[PDB]
């Protein structure tokens, strides 16, 4: 069994190497099967607050709401990593149909975009600082990895198949 930080460096480097790479549960397992608390396993993504500050209704509902947001946030990350970045990548509008209906439905969703590099705030959206030519590839890959990892954990929790199901359910309010 690979060490936590060993597997983490490996996965993050692979995602940076190939932006469209799919990760299996077998690869991700050392990251989510760890006995470490949720707040300790995530070093960039604020997974703890995401789970806690969006506990509205039953877990069957809000975990799916969170999963939907995480699915889109992952796409935002992979876009920044792609060899050909999509047009208009330097900014995300709050009134964007995709963002508004998926990411902005969760508290902390905008903070994830800030982690990607969208740190400058205007009343109409977030964007990269003027003068910053390229995204921080190492940072984006790390955040993207943690986003897809968290979505994976929520999927397992919903399927009642998470290796640390019993412990993680205590985080569900």
């Amino acid at each position: 069994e690979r060490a936590f930080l060993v597997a983490r460096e490996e996965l993050a480097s692979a995602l940076r190497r190939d932006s469209g790479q799919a990760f299996s549960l077998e690869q991700l397992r050392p990251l989510l099967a760890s006995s470490l608390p949720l707040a300790a396993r995530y070093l960039q993504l604020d997974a703890a607050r995401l789970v806690r500050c969006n506990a509205h209704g039953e877990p069957r509902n809000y975990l799916n709401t969170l999963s939907t947001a995480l699915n889109i946030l992952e796409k935002y990350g992979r876009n920044l990593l792609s060899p050909q970045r999509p047009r208009y990548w330097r900014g995300v509008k709050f009134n964007n149909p995709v963002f508004r209906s998926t990411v902005d439905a969760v508290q902390g969703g905008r903070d994830v975009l800030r982690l990607y590099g969208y740190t400058e705030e205007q009343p109409d959206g977030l964007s990269f600082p003027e003068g910053q030519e390229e995204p921080d590839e190492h940072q984006v890959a790390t955040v993207t990895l943690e986003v897809l990892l968290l979505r994976t954990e929520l999927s397992l929790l919903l399927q009642n198949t998470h290796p640390r199901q019993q412990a993680l359910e205590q985080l569900l309010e």
């Binding site: 889109i72 796409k75 935002y76 876009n79 999509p86 047009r87 208009y88 990548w89 900014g91 995300v92 509008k93 709050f94 009134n95 964007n96 149909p97 995709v98 963002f99 508004r100 109409d124 959206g125």
Partner: peptide, 13 residues
Amino acid sequence: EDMYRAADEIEKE
């Protein structure tokens, strides 16, 4: 679909 521009700016196109 577009994930960056505002809904109205996308509606202009």
